[model samples]
Structure formats: structure tokens, C-alpha cells
Target: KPKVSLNPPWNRIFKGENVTLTCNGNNFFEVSSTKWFHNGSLSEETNSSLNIVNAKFEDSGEYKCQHQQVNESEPVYLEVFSDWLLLQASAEVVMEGQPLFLRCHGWRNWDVYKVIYYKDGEALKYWYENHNISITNATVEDSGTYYCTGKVWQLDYESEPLNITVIK
Candidate 1:
């Protein structure tokens, strides 16, 4: 018998946040071999996750869970959303050399999510199993929205958009 299940059916995550996926099943047939799939296809070994730490816009996509070699399991899909913050601020307040931070939030597996930060469209920092975004310095160039994702079996969820502004 082959079947899969998740803790939370829905949740959200930050761009640079770290998420975990726990697979539980009797594996009745003793099919020890297991693998994760993204949208029904074999997924990259990024810790059994399709996205790596500090996710980007490219990370957004349809995801699912699958178990092979034992029995064909049903496929689950998750609609991913990118967190882009829209904040109100003036120039000389959002430039480079300044510090910025982004926070990703959501619910899953009964564990409180964590925060993830990025700089100039790239992942900059992240908290391990914690929620917080830290940035030092202040400038105008440091501006962007941040987001994260939550996962449970074959499903994934995204967090709201968080914006950061730097002042000179």
C-alpha cells in the first residue's frame, strides 16, 4: 500500500526562508526508495525541495508530491506566489549601500515559519527555523520585496509581500 499525507494543507513562506518536508507512510511493501517530484516530474535534489534557500521569482511554480517503485500515488499541486513588498518612501531613502530586510510568513506542520531576506533580486540572508529579517546600513538602492514558501507533502504555500526601504 502506498499513500502520502501532509501536516498543514496550506501555509506561506519567505524568499530566503528554510522549509522542511516530512514524508510518512507504512511503505507496506518495504519500498525504502523514495523521491520527490515537482509537478509530476522528477525534482532536483535541493534537499528534496524544488527550490533552494532564498528563493527567487524563478522558484515560483506548480509543485506536487509522488512516490515511486511501490505504488502510484495521487498527485498534489500547489500554487506558488512571490512576495513583493510595496512600501511608501522617497528617494535618497532607498538607494544602495543601505540595509534592507524582507520577512516571509505562513503556517504548516504546527511549526511557526521563519524569515528570509534578499538584496537586489538575490537572496541575501535567512533564519533557520526562525522568523526575522536583518539588514545593516541604509541607502536608496537597497529596495525590494521578500517572500517565502510552506510545504506539506505534495502541496506548497506562499507568504505575503514585504518591502524594505533604505535612507541615506
Candidate 2:
């Protein structure tokens, strides 16, 4: 199946940042003339890599792509936030037994301390000054809504919620 990927490999990003969406085809085919879909329908782009510069909240959605030689790909959810913090996931979907990583990020790369990760509104982990957390072996039961909270300077900021699904 064809696949859509992000350049930075991070799905959550803040405003004014740039992201590149590339279409990957199976069977080692040519990488050109791709059609991209955002939310639904065509996004008026036809390139192997769709570059969105200075991203806005309008860019937050499910992104998929297609090529003449390959079938349409599964949607890759991309979230563009205007808030001070964000809970970022490494992949759009995590297959069973695959490791998944979550990130607590502060806007503009600001210092984040006393980070706390939550799953379904419950505290999952706590890291003092550490921003990354990993689930080495994830199962379908581990799938749920995730969020993070941290201190960026003197203020406490909570990230937007993220739905992480682990599929078999």
C-alpha cells in the first residue's frame, strides 16, 4: 500500500513551522505526480512531496495521498497547534507489538520542565525535565487519548489531546 509520511517525522507541530508530506509507493516505483488529500477530497497538490510552509490551524487534519501506480494511502493525522505546548506522537498509528514514543514539547523549543503524560485523563508517567516517553511494547489495550502537561518557564501549560490507536 502507498504511505504518507512527514519530513520531520513528528505529527504535532506549532504554528509558523514547516512540514513536508511525501507519498511513498510500494514495489519501488517512480516518485512523481502524486495527489494529496487533506481532511477529505483533493488538496490541489500534485507532487511527490507536498510542502506546507508557515503552517496554520487549518493544516491540522488527516492527510493521505495517491499515485498513478499505487492505491490511496491510509490517512496520516497532522496536528498544527497555536498553543504553548503539544503532545506529539511518533506515528499516526501504532501496530500491535510496535514501540511508540510520545513527546511533550514547548513552543519555539522553549525549556519544558516537570513534564507529566496522561492517558485518558489519568497520569501515565512523570518526567522531571525529560520530554520524551516510550512504550516499548504496545498492545491494543494501550490505545487511548493522550495528553501532556509541563511548565514552560513560570507558567503551566497543557497540550492538546491526541488520540493514539494501537491496531492489531
Candidate 3:
């Protein structure tokens, strides 16, 4: 099976950032040319490397490359977000056992159905009708980078990451 890797290896990135996706597998012996895809649609690029500059929300999709294989390489999901929303933390430094508050607000005025929260890269499940989040009794494991994305229909606006320090 072909292996696919992203240069930055980040699933999400800010707008106007550069992203590179590389497809590697079987040497030149088996494969002659590589085909790139965006959201399952074949791309014009046929090289081993797919470079995207100044990425935008429209660039968000699943990318996969194929090279002389019956099956295509595993897809790499990419999400490019603009600075529409801001992720705010109640306090950057808080003592253990204290509560933490986070909110994502900006741009849109209407109420949103859901907002996605991310901790250090992984998503958190506090969605479905709210934009604010609260954590009671903070722990050491809770100390990390946090951010949120507001989903407005087909588009999602991601906020900047905020670091929270939980001190014992």
C-alpha cells in the first residue's frame, strides 16, 4: 500500500499558509507517475508532490495520491480556516481544581447550532447548540493548547489556539 504524508502534518492550519502533501511508496520500479486528488476529484498535478500555497477554506478536503496501485493511498484531511472567530480563555494561568472557561466568538451574528473544540490537536465533544465551554476541576492533563471552530453551514471558521496552564 502507498503511504501518504503531509509536510506540516497538521490537519488544520490558518489561512494563507503553505501546505505540501507527498506520496511515497514502491520505488520508480513499479510506479511511473503519481496522480493527485482533491476531495476525490482528480487533479491536474501528476507529480509525487502536491504543493498548495495560500490555502483557503475551499481547499479543505480529503487528498489522496495514486501511483501504479490498484488502490489509492490513504487520504490526508486538510482544513484551512480564516480568522473569523476568536478562541478565548478565561485565564491563561489557573490553579488546579479551579474551573476553566472558553468561548469562541466573532464574525457571525446569528446563533450557531454547533462549535467544535480542539485540545492540543484532538477534538472535544462539547457541541450541539452552544459556543461556550466550561471545565470544572482542572487537572494536569487538561493543560494544553485549546481552540474552537464555529460551524456555519458548509464553512467552519477556526479560532486561534490559546494555551492554558494548570498549576498545582
Candidate 4:
């Protein structure tokens, strides 16, 4: 069958979740060997299964199982996932009361409708059509990791966390 399947397809894995994918099928000699692929490129090792210690959104993608058999193909889809984070706070440091700027960036440029920044878990700033966020006259309370939520098309809300420290 020229099709792909995934077990526990959508899993909410934390930062470090020992993940294992088992590839099973028919045809041994004719099967040649089973290989794994992350996203699209061939994975590091030619193991039928894949293991990840610390899972992150960056590790999320369409993992596939490939067969080396001649004229034969075996590909399975593997989905990676990570817990969504809204914000992060950095340690309070001496900023000398100078205007501070914090940048909220995204990993991949996909369907990001709006970007918003929050302080103390409250909405502080927002961005439209523009990328990256900044904080003016940042105070000690603002000395923490910032997070941005992305409104992706088809996909639900996605967010990332970042920390910014102030210094003298």
C-alpha cells in the first residue's frame, strides 16, 4: 500500500520527552533497509525508528520512513510537538533606568497574522504586519522572558518564549 500512517500522531510533548517511533511492515530481503527522515531530508542514522531526548517545536515536522528496496518505497509520517508557551521572565538586573528594547522573533515565516507581547502575563504591546517587538523604557518588572503568539492559518494558535536581561 502506497500510504503513510502515524501512531499517537498529535502528542503534546514537553522540552525533554523520550520519543520513539516504531516502523513495521512486510518484505524482509526485498525490503532492503528501513530509514528515517526528519522533515524531508534523511535523518542522521539509518534507523527504522527515531528517538528524541529533548523535544521542541523546531523538532516538529513530517517525519517519514523510507525503504531502500529497489523500486520499493516505505514512508511513514511522524509528527513532533511541544507545549505552547505564552511568556517568559528574565532575572531582574540593573538597567540603569535606560530605555530598553526587547525583540520578539518567530522561527519560520509561515502564517503569522498578529504578534503580541505581554508583561506580568498582561498584554503590553502588539504588532501588525510588522515582525519583531520592542519595549520602550523597559523597567525592572519588564526584565523577563517575553513571548509572542502567532495566529496561523488552518493550524491553531502557536507561541514562542524569549528572555531579555537588563544590565548596567
The residue-by-residue lDDT of candidate 4 on 1-168, one tens digit each, is 223333233232345545565554332313326666676787776555456666666676666665655332354333343444332222223375665544432333243556677554677666665354544565656566556665555343545545566665
Sorted on TM-score, best first, the list reads 2, 3, 4, 1
lDDT assessment of candidate 4? 0.49
Worst 10 residues of 4 by lDDT: 85-94
lDDT of 3 by residue, 58-80 (tens): 89999898876558987877776
**Over 4 Å off in model 3, which ranges?**
25-32, 84-145, 148-168
Candidate 3 TM-score versus the reference: 0.49
Question: For each candidate, how many residue pairs have backbone atoms clashing (under 3 Å)?
Answer: 20, 0, 0, 7
Write model 1 residue lDDT over 13-78, tens digit each, in one string. 434444343344422323334566655666655332233455444444444444554554554433
lDDT of each: 0.43, 0.84, 0.74, 0.49
lDDT of 2 by residue, 1-168 (tens): 878877777887999899887786333434668888888878787867789999989989999998777788988888777788878888758899999988887888788988999999899888888659888999898899998898888988888888989999
CA shift of 168, model 4, Å: 4.3
Q: Cα RMSD (Å) between model 2 and the true structure?
A: 3.0
Question: For candidate 1, which ten residues in a row score worst on lDDT?
Answer: 84-93
Question: Which candidate gets the maximum lDDT versus the true structure?
Answer: 2
Best prediction by TM-score: 2
- Per-residue error (Å), model 1, residue 122: 38
Off by over 4 Å in 1: 1-10, 25-32, 46-52, 79-168
Query: Which sections of candidate 4 miss by over 4 Å?
Result: 1-94, 97-101, 136-138
RMSD of each: 16.9, 3.0, 12.5, 15.0
Query: Comparing 1 and 3 by TM-score, which wins?
Result: 3
